[PDB]
Amino acid sequence: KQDMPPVGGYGPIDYKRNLPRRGLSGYSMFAVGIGALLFGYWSMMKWNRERRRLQIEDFEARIALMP
Amino acid sequence: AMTPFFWMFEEREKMFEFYERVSGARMHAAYVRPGGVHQDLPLGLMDDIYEFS
């Protein structure tokens, strides 16, 4: 008279299938990308242009000597 | 692919446990007979299949 099945206490667990979490898609991407990339080239032309100014100063000390 | 082999067999060893508790042995159990099951399964296995499944 000592046998298994309980009178109660059950679930069940699902048979389902779901993890579609979105996700920042669909014109949200391709907009943060271009907005990041244009910040890069804007951070250029303030350094590459400025290094071009110090470049001429480096040639300047050459030319003021050599006679 | 390396991991889903390892990711499932680590979980699979919760289920070769269940053969040993009922028949006596690890994989090849001589349990089913031509007149039904050999012997009764112990007090348990319904609070342990249920936690597993």
Structure description:
- The structure is cut from a larger assembly and holds chains A (67 residues) and B (53 residues).
- Chain A is mainly α.
- Chain A contains 2 helices and no strands.
- The longest helix of chain A has 17 residues, at 48-64.
- Chain A is rod-shaped, with a radius of gyration of 34 Å.
- Chain B is mainly alpha-helical and 53 residues long.
- Chain B is 38% helix and 8% strand.
- Chain B has 3 helices and 2 strands, in the order H-H-E-E-H.
- Chain B has helices at residues 3-12, 17-22, 49-52; strands at 32-33, 36-37.
- Chain B has a two-stranded antiparallel sheet with strand order 1-2.
- The interface between A and B is small, with 8 and 6 residues.
The general outline of chain B is extended
Please give the largest β-sheet of chain A.
Answer: none
Strands ordered across the widest β-sheet of chain B? 1-2
The dominant shape of chain A is rod-shaped
* Cα radius of gyration of chain B in angstroms: 14 Å
Largest sheet of chain B: 2 strands, antiparallel
How many extended strands of chain A? 0
Helix percentage range of chain B: 25-40%
Count of individual helical segments of chain B = 3
**Which two chains share the most extensive interface?**
A-B, 8 and 6 residues
Structural class of chain A: mainly alpha
Please report the distance between the alpha carbons of the first and last residues of chain B. Answer: 26 Å
Measured distance between first and last alpha carbons of chain A: 117 Å
Order of helices and strands of chain A: HH
PDB class: oxidoreductase
Keywords: respiratory, electron transport, oxidoreductase
Entry title: Activity optimized complex I (closed form)
Chain A: NADH dehydrogenase [ubiquinone] 1 alpha subcomplex subunit 13
